[PDB]
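new request in #modeling-help
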Amino acid sequence: NLISEQNVTVTMDLQPVLQLSMQGSETVSFVFSQISEYIGGLTQYGAVDLSVSSTVDWCL
Amino acid sequence: NLISEQNVTVTMDLQPVLQLSMQGSETVSFVFSQISEYIGGLTQYGAVDLSVSSTVDWCL
């Protein structure tokens, strides 16, 4: 039972990837100068959007 | 009782045979450069093997 052997060591790392990419304007400005704006207020549509890249279970 | 004789001398030597044959690498190097290596450490399998040839009782 003569034995000649060679060994290799395998190292595997699962680095966590957590990315939150936001597109839009980092300043959102509401300007009230008319009466209508005062009574009803500015409604801004699609100001900021968020995209999520993840490896594990995530909650935003 | 007439005698004619011839003599031969027999010499026997039991020379001790002590052999320790090692296979592998005479340098074993542990390199730590990653955090995982630091916390857990390199485990090297089958680095060196030893074979013993002997005639008498031996302890290694």
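bot summary: Chain A touches chain B through seven residues (CB under 8 Å).
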